[PDB]
Design an enzyme around this catalytic site. Structure first.
Site, mmCIF file in Angstrom:
data_model
loop_
_atom_site.group_PDB
_atom_site.id
_atom_site.type_symbol
_atom_site.label_atom_id
_atom_site.label_comp_id
_atom_site.label_asym_id
_atom_site.label_seq_id
_atom_site.Cartn_x
_atom_site.Cartn_y
_atom_site.Cartn_z
ATOM 1 N N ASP A 72 0.819 -1.212 0.000
ATOM 2 C CA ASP A 72 0.000 0.000 0.000
ATOM 3 C C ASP A 72 0.857 1.268 0.000
ATOM 4 O O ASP A 72 1.292 1.730 1.063
ATOM 5 C CB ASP A 72 -0.936 -0.048 1.193
ATOM 6 C CG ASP A 72 -1.916 1.086 1.219
ATOM 7 O OD1 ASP A 72 -1.888 1.975 0.337
ATOM 8 O OD2 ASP A 72 -2.734 1.083 2.141
ATOM 9 N N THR A 73 1.031 1.868 -1.187
ATOM 10 C CA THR A 73 1.784 3.120 -1.313
ATOM 11 C C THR A 73 1.084 4.309 -0.658
ATOM 12 O O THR A 73 1.746 5.309 -0.356
ATOM 13 C CB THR A 73 2.070 3.430 -2.787
ATOM 14 O OG1 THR A 73 0.841 3.563 -3.515
ATOM 15 C CG2 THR A 73 2.914 2.306 -3.423
ATOM 16 N N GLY A 74 -0.219 4.223 -0.399
ATOM 17 C CA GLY A 74 -0.916 5.288 0.294
ATOM 18 C C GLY A 74 -0.845 5.240 1.806
ATOM 19 O O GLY A 74 -1.495 6.040 2.484
HETATM 20 C C1 LIG Z 1 -6.723 6.696 2.986
HETATM 21 C C2 LIG Z 1 -5.195 6.675 2.738
HETATM 22 C C3 LIG Z 1 -4.661 8.121 2.594
HETATM 23 C C4 LIG Z 1 -4.499 6.011 3.965
HETATM 24 N N1 LIG Z 1 -4.894 4.585 4.094
HETATM 25 C C5 LIG Z 1 -4.200 3.583 3.224
HETATM 26 C C6 LIG Z 1 -5.092 3.233 2.015
HETATM 27 O O1 LIG Z 1 -4.375 2.473 1.112
HETATM 28 C C7 LIG Z 1 -6.300 2.415 2.463
HETATM 29 C C8 LIG Z 1 -5.861 0.970 2.735
HETATM 30 C C9 LIG Z 1 -7.132 0.183 3.151
HETATM 31 C C10 LIG Z 1 -7.758 -0.681 2.255
HETATM 32 C C11 LIG Z 1 -8.914 -1.366 2.648
HETATM 33 F F1 LIG Z 1 -9.529 -2.217 1.771
HETATM 34 C C12 LIG Z 1 -9.437 -1.177 3.928
HETATM 35 C C13 LIG Z 1 -8.798 -0.307 4.816
HETATM 36 F F2 LIG Z 1 -9.280 -0.113 6.080
HETATM 37 C C14 LIG Z 1 -7.651 0.377 4.428
HETATM 38 N N2 LIG Z 1 -7.223 2.410 1.345
HETATM 39 C C15 LIG Z 1 -8.651 2.749 1.471
HETATM 40 O O2 LIG Z 1 -9.089 3.334 2.412
HETATM 41 O O3 LIG Z 1 -9.497 2.345 0.405
HETATM 42 C C16 LIG Z 1 -10.828 2.158 0.773
HETATM 43 C C17 LIG Z 1 -11.727 3.224 0.005
HETATM 44 C C18 LIG Z 1 -10.999 3.682 -1.154
HETATM 45 O O4 LIG Z 1 -11.490 2.607 -2.562
HETATM 46 C C19 LIG Z 1 -11.678 1.068 -1.964
HETATM 47 O O5 LIG Z 1 -10.411 0.502 -1.777
HETATM 48 C C20 LIG Z 1 -10.268 0.080 -0.307
HETATM 49 C C21 LIG Z 1 -11.308 0.860 0.353
HETATM 50 C C22 LIG Z 1 -12.351 1.146 -0.671
HETATM 51 C C23 LIG Z 1 -12.817 2.541 -0.424
HETATM 52 S S1 LIG Z 1 -5.210 4.051 5.718
HETATM 53 O O6 LIG Z 1 -5.594 2.630 5.740
HETATM 54 O O7 LIG Z 1 -6.324 4.786 6.305
HETATM 55 C C24 LIG Z 1 -3.633 4.298 6.598
HETATM 56 C C25 LIG Z 1 -2.615 3.359 6.592
HETATM 57 C C26 LIG Z 1 -1.425 3.599 7.269
HETATM 58 C C27 LIG Z 1 -1.228 4.797 7.949
HETATM 59 N N3 LIG Z 1 -0.148 5.174 8.635
HETATM 60 C C28 LIG Z 1 -0.247 6.400 9.211
HETATM 61 N N4 LIG Z 1 0.813 7.011 10.010
HETATM 62 C C29 LIG Z 1 0.631 8.351 10.565
HETATM 63 C C30 LIG Z 1 0.699 9.490 9.551
HETATM 64 C C31 LIG Z 1 1.891 9.219 10.495
HETATM 65 S S2 LIG Z 1 -1.813 7.107 8.858
HETATM 66 C C32 LIG Z 1 -2.233 5.735 7.953
HETATM 67 C C33 LIG Z 1 -3.423 5.482 7.281
#
Ligand SMILES: CC(C)CN(C[C@@H](O)[C@H](Cc1cc(F)cc(F)c1)NC(=O)O[C@H]1[C@H]2CO[C@H]3OC[C@@H]1[C@H]3C2)S(=O)(=O)c1ccc2nc(NC3CC3)sc2c1
Lengths: 99, 99
Positions: B25-27
């Site tokens: 996960d690059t995000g």
């Molecule tokens: C929202 C991003 C900006 C951050 N995120 C990573 C994304 O890759 C998530 C990954 C994920 C996938 C899932 F399947 C379920 C999930 F719970 C999470 N992707 C997502 O939300 O996708 C969602 C929505 C988008 O389209 C579809 O795809 C999947 C679903 C769906 C709808 S994180 O998880 O919130 C994150 C991780 C580590 C971290 N480290 C931190 N450190 C502090 C700052 C110092 S803050 C921080 C935050």
């Protein structure tokens, strides 16, 4: 380009005539953008992430230019804290993960 | 390997003697794993994502084998719906984005 991951992989996008920065996010199935003014029809939707769910507006067949590459597809608009380019558009610009 | 993004970039990892699957996960700045039994001492933390925040336990200097590559670093453990390998570990296995 080749992008290393020591910093956030942020990219400039152009969508709906506006310029924004967005995160290239391989962990996102779909593309979700912060509240912005987008023309056309939209359909209500709820998506889930790490902390729970948000309601978004789904727009289809939206043109985005991502770091100079054009793509067309679905864009979700709502209270995300960061603009995320997800895999539905990453595949269109030929993005791959390499290690 | 080279990973295209038509499907979720899932990889097998070994951590704390257990085998799991996790999303490259690059995000994600940090690495966040579902509730699991880890040996070390931990520290309470709170992280934010799409729908709000979750409480996690932070473990430092944890060894993870990601698709055969070894990395050591911080792992957050808590109620994430998906195991996420974040940039703190992606940089250690040499992962890049390419388009
Ligand atoms: C929202 C991003 C900006 C951050 N995120 C990573 C994304 O890759 C998530 C990954 C994920 C996938 C899932 F399947 C379920 C999930 F719970 C999470 N992707 C997502 O939300 O996708 C969602 C929505 C988008 O389209 C579809 O795809 C999947 C679903 C769906 C709808 S994180 O998880 O919130 C994150 C991780 C580590 C971290 N480290 C931190 N450190 C502090 C700052 C110092 S803050 C921080 C935050």
């Amino acid at each position: 380009p080749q992008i290393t991951l020591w910093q956030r992989p942020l990219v400039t996008i152009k969508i709906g005539g506006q310029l924004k920065e967005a995160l290239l996010d391989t962990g996102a199935d779909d593309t979700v953008l912060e509240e912005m003014s987008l023309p056309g029809r939209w359909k209500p939707k709820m998506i889930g992430g790490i902390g729970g769910f948000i309601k978004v507006r789904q727009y289809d067949q939206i043109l985005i230019e991502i770091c100079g590459h054009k793509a067309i597809g679905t864009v979700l608009v709502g209270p995300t804290p960061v603009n995320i380019i997800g895999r539905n558009l990453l595949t269109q610009i030929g993005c791959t993960l390499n290690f």
